[PDB]
A paper describes a structure:
At least one functional cNLS was identified for each HPyV LTA, except for KIPyV and STLPyV, where no functional monopartite cNLSs were found. We therefore reasoned that nuclear import of several HPyV LTAs, including those from STLPyV and KIPyV, could be mediated by bipartite cNLSs. In the STLPyV LTA NLSbip structure, electron density for the entire cNLS including the linker region was clearly resolved. For all bipartite cNLSs, the IMPα2ΔIBB P2 major site pocket is occupied by a K residue, forming hydrogen bonds with IMPα2ΔIBB residues and a salt bridge with D192, whereas the P2’ minor site pocket is occupied by an R residue, forming hydrogen bonds with IMPα2ΔIBB residues and a salt bridge with E396. As expected, neither STLPyV LTA cNLS nor KIPyV LTA cNLS targeted GFP to the nucleus, in stark contrast to both STLPyV LTA NLSbip and KIPyV LTA NLSbip, which conferred strong nuclear localization. Intriguingly, both GFP‐STLPyV LTA NLSbip_m, bearing the K124A/R125A/K127A substitutions, and GFP‐KIPyV LTA NLSbip_m, bearing the K119A/R120A substitutions, were considerably less nuclear. Indeed, both the upstream and downstream cNLSs could tolerate mutations impairing their ability to bind IMPα autonomously (gray orange bars), preserving their ability to simultaneously bind to the minor and major binding sites as a bona fide bipartite cNLS. This scenario is exemplified by STLPyV and KIPyV LTA bipartite cNLSs, where the upstream cNLS has lost most key features of a monopartite cNLS.
In the best characterized pathway, importin (IMP) α bridges cargoes bearing basic, classical nuclear localization signals (cNLSs) to IMPβ1, which mediates transport through the nuclear pore complex. We addressed this possibility by x‐ray crystallography, and solved the structures of putative bipartite cNLS peptides of MWPyV, STLPyV, WUPyV, KIPyV, and MCPyV LTAs bound to IMPα2ΔIBB.
Numbering used by the authors:
A (entry chain B): 124 to 144
B (entry chain A): 72 to 497
The structure:
Amino acid sequence: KRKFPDSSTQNSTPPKKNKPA
Amino acid sequence: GTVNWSVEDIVKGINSNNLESQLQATQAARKLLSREKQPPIDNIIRAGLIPKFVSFLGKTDCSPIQFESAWALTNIASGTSEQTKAVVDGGAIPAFISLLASPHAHISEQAVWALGNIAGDGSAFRDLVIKHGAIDPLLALLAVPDLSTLACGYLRNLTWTLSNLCRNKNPAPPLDAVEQILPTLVRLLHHNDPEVLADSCWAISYLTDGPNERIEMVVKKGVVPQLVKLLGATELPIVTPALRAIGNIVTGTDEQTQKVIDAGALAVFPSLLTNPKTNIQKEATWTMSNITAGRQDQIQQVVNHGLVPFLVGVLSKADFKTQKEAAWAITNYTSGGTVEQIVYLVHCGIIEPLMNLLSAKDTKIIQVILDAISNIFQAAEKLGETEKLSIMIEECGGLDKIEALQRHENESVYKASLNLIEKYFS
């Protein structure tokens, strides 16, 4: 059984979003 | 109008003693900060404007300046960690939480969005948002009989912010906050909007990314069948997080894994293991490797679903990262499988692609493959067929590769290859 490391990326999409004009 | 003001003019307006002048200058800042080309975030911060924006969040009597300030701050908080920190340091968190109760939906929504950016920065700000009490009022916004009566954009932004409260590790989110959020996530996972589905899937994938006790809290809510259904979706933005969550779940106990199998997941893997997107193939093969690390009856379900030929396929041709995952799947299968299961594996054609991969530069995959070869020879010993296997490995060039591996920098490789040759090719 092989988990993702704790340093792994949970999502390639970044967590933050700007609100565009 | 309020377009293309200088930061100097914004400052002059915000420092006037005139609420309408302040509003116009805040709107001008909002427009500067929402321009795609290099919004001047650091200039706005250096001008000292964050505390003024934060105080404007409290002006219940001028909702337009609440909205403009909330938007400006949202876009500052969407930046680097140092820019998000400037927003937090200005007192924004409780002010935004107070705005969640606004009677104006566009303002509550802007507050949701800002808190999503703050929490998305990382574990510490996520946990700080939770400590200031954000979860109760966020979840109250979704306490309606039918989610379809909410505006679509509003619901999508709430779902995304909730997913950021579930995101990140070291540490993972507080256990009590997870238990508080999960029933709403389960409800969002049955909603009919593709973006809401994708993001509630991502949230579940975050929450199952950790020790088996976290997996258990999710699996106990009964979501595995819905995850398997989403795994079968046509939209890649849904399949991707659904597959990550399923894969995370099968890293857990044999019983957690069995819930995934029971729910019908394996029937989707012929498509996933041949999916045109390499990341889907890689994560589906990783998932299979964790299933073949299970009990013999789970290995047998892999067999029954016709998935061994698909594993042979990915071992034979796939992106190298996927091939590494396939090598793990084979080593696990051969470690835990019955003799009949290992014989079946050889009859499906595993030996040749397995040997062809010993010419790879990665040391860990060579170790994994040599362990699998050894496991297979150990199955052949119980049948007195070590010789037929040695012949098979010889006819496809594998003996040459093992010999060459004797002269390998790594110790484990050298030892395993030399043992194999001395024990079966001498």
